[PDB]
Design a protein around this nucleic acid. Structure first.
Lengths: 46, 108, 105, 58
RNA sequence: GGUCAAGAUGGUAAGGGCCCACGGUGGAUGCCUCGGCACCCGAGCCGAUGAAGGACGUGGCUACCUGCGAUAAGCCAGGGG
RNA sequence: ACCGUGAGGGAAAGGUGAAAAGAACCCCGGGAGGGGAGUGAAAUAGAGCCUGAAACCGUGGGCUUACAAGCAGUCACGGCC
RNA sequence: GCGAAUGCCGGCAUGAGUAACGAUAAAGAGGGUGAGAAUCCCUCUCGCCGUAAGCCCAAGGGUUCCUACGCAAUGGUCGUCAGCGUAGGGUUAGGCGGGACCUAAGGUGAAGCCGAAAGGCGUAGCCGAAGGGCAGCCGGUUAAUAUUCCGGCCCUUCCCGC
RNA sequence: GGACCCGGUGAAAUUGAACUGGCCGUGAAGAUGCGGCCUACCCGUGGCAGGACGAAAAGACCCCGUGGAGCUUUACUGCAG
RNA sequence: CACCCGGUGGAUGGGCCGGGGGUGUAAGCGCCGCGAGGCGUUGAGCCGACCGGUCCCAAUCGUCCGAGGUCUUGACC
């Protein structure tokens, strides 16, 4: 059926992961956004 | 005279309903074979709520036999709101309409 | 079809072994005649007869067991070598008035 | 695909009325052969074994 | 006392409609608080002597909440008790 | 908590009592749950257990129902209660 | 100050005890346990696979795995059964796989190069894999592990001495 | 193989409400509910589609808002090059 | 569902049994040919509901409900 979910450790991870977000302006942005703003955890945390 | 009961009773209030609506107001011992040898579920149950009934009395509510069921009833409540196939999109839940079960046992 | 038989089969089988089982109304009502019929063959008793009876049942032990064993205990009567008796209760959820049947004895 | 569905709140009244023709009817049972008690009109039981032959237990 | 002939009212409810009494189911409601909201006076910087924020972590006996983190419900010194 | 791969979205859910004194024991029962005793000012205050309304499902009773039309009904006259 | 906005939120009735049991690869019998078993355990007939409805390596999911207790709800019926509950316990490697080695794409990126700022590019070097490379195998052994645990047989790299 | 009878489970959109007959007439001009009339007991289950202008969706075809969005050239202007 | 006939003083199911109908002479042994087979026994064998016998089998035993005879007038015994 091929949905769109097949997760890929390697993938998903990579792609998304503390770092990256960081590395980025943007990413970083929102991130520290989320952080306070909301609490929670985060991607990679995932 | 005395009485038996029990809520949080999983079952078709309705169905149940037929149950008594039979053995209903009648000789103890007597129906005590109705539900013993009748059919549809509930029975089993129904039976039960007749024994702690006949009991309770004689025991703490007192003259055996000469007894019966001046009256018997069942109520629904608590539901069991149950989830089913998302309209293949939106949820469709039924409800095993919990089931109460009171029933009298007074002496002739 | 292939199922009607099968049944009669294993039922006919099992039974002869005990000679009175527990299947529902019908089920029994039939396993009778047949099984029954079969009997009447153990009675015939011989090359042929046996070559049939077995033909279905499939199994020396019995097959023989009955032809010799029981057969006799019956050599006299006129069919009926079975007494299909209904039963008092009923399998649950269901509510099927099962029943029991045996080789009239 | 709901071509046809009710069209007007069924009316408790009626509704039930419907559910009306329904009703039970206690097992016609009789009384023991010698088993003494009430059995399923025509059968032995956890009281019998008899009928005419002891084909049961207890 | 019987028979025919006619003539008109009643009881019987499977369930049902209204009224009454007693439950059940459901939580409106009133009053209430360890919480907000709002405005005014106080205050006003943290950071490598690796912050803010998490990670996995100890309680004798365990997920969570907590306070710390390895010298983990705490180790020193002084004031209050 | 939960749908979203992500950025992001984002709920519901408070209330026994003066304090537990939170129901030892005996009963039908596989139990849950129901019958007694005991706390008690009251437990139809009893463990999601203050107030706990309606809708909606029950159990009995009064009246009523089988040549009859309209959600409705409201005006008249009659019998049962 | 509310019927009333296909209104929002919550409950609650409808149709309705009719519609559905997720492939027409079927079963049935005897015994056993249990409060209670068409739906559990043993056993004997029977049907369906069989290129699968086989074992295996991966990826994904992570205790779901075993064992003793238990069924309130999840199991579109039961249910003493469970890939459900609680409790305890289980998966060990110089040589198998990943790293302690190598680079293409690509990504980073001291120097260098250009942006209003955030930034862009980017050498060498580095990151980067079932591509390269690398030293073992067969049997036994528990409720679960196993090329790791047993044992029998086969080896590799580093170090000190001569 | 469902459907039907049994047992176990047990939804779903739409719906003001309703005990909802035909006629020929009518009204906003294609009425079970309004008029006259004729048939007309109370309920149900297995069905058969016609009417309830049945369900789905605030017509996509239409026009109307000096609504919007895409492509076009000797439309207006303006920028990139 | 209602509807019809029967409920062991029964023939109602099945069973058996004769009878029909139906498939084309069976399983075995036999005798011919190296074999394949054939020819025989043998119109055999086997037979699902069709016509009818016989209490082998199985409709045992049991319950429940059910009338009484509403009011007036008159016509006759």
């Amino acid at each position: 059926m091929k949905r769109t979910y097949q997760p890929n450790n390697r993938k998903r991870a990579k792609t998304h992961g503390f770092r990256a977000r960081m590395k980025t302006k943007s990413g970083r942005n929102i991130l520290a956004r989320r952080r306070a703003k909301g609490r929670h955890q985060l991607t990679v945390s995932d | 005279e005395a009485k038996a009961i029990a809520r949080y009773v999983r079952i078709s209030p309705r169905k149940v309903r037929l149950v008594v609506d039979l053995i209903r107001g009648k000789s103890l011992e007597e129906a005590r074979n109705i539900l013993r040898y009748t059919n549809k579920r509930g029975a089993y149950f129904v039976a039960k709520v007749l024994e702690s009934a006949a009991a309770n009395a004689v025991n703490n509510h007192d003259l055996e036999d000469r007894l019966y069921v001046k009256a018997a009833y069942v109520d629904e409540g608590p539901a069991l709101k149950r989830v089913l196939p998302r309209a293949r999109g939106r949820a469709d839940i039924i409800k095993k309409r919990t089931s109460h079960i009171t029933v009298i046992l007074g002496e002739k | 079809s292939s199922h009607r038989l099968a049944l009669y089969r294993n039922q006919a089988k099992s039974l002869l072994t005990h000679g009175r089982i527990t299947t529902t109304v019908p089920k029994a009502k039939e396993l009778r005649g047949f099984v029954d019929h079969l009997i009447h063959l153990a009675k015939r008793g011989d090359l042929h007869a046996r070559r049939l009876v077995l033909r279905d049942l499939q199994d020396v032990k019995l097959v023989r067991k009955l032809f010799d064993e029981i057969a006799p205990r019956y050599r006299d009567r006129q069919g009926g070598y079975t007494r299909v008796l209904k039963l008092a209760e009923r399998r649950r959820g269901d509510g099927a008035p099962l029943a029991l049947v045996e080789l009239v004895e | 695909a709901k071509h046809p569905v009710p069209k007007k709140k069924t009316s408790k009244s009626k509704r039930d009325m419907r559910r009306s023709h329904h009703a039970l009817t206690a097992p016609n049972l009789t009384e023991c052969p010698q088993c003494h008690g009430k059995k399923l009109s025509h059968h032995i039981c956890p009281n019998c074994g008899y009928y005419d032959g002891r084909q049961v237990l207890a």
